[PDB]
Amino acid sequence: HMVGMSGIGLWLKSLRLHKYIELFKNMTYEEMLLITEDFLQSVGVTKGASHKLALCIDKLKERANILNRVEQELLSGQMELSTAVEELTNIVLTPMKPLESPGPPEENIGLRFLKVIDIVTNTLQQDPYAVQDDETLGVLMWILDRSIHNEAFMNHASQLKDLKFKLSKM
């Protein structure tokens, strides 16, 4: 697989679409983002899966805005941690290019994702009852878990394990 596509299989499995793993064979990250429902129907994907995958690809394109929004609303106190962690859950397994990918930092998905993780874990440790929310804390630990193994975060794995360790001891 090419840059940013090492997690394509796990992502598809998460959407119950791993049946189409071969479609991505030598596809580049940029090509994946050019996928349309029309293209999928044309290459043998059922109309149902074509629509669903097209929707998922569209959501991939919204990641930067979603992360930007979560960052903002958490900093303003408008968004609950449970909500922020739910949003992250739907992004953590998506195909992400390495942090070292040149371009506007604001559009660097991996970077925005790690930024939100910092805000979340920081807001958490400052919440007197944070420890009492077993559900939210459990999802977050799973997120850190999947992030530690995301090749795009290769050079941050150490910091992530540390963070996850700190939280496990609250």
Give Cα separations from 123 to 63, 74, 137 (angstroms).
21, 8, 12
Query: 121 and 166 share a domain?
Result: yes
Task: Among 42, 61, 80, identify where a domain stops.
Answer: 61
Neighbours of 133 (CB within 10 A): 17
CA within 13 Å, CB half, 17: 21
> From CA 89, how far away is CA 45, in angstroms rounded?
26
Q: How far apart are CA 124 and CA 169, in angstroms?
A: 13
61, 92, 109 - which closes a domain: 61
Largest separation between any pair of C-alpha atoms in the chain: 54
Tally the domains of the chain: 2
CB neighbourhood size of 126 (10 A): 8
Residues 106 and 136 reside in one and the same domain: yes
**What was the resolution (in A) of this experimentally determined structure?**
1.8
Rounded Cα distance, 157 and 130, in Å: 24
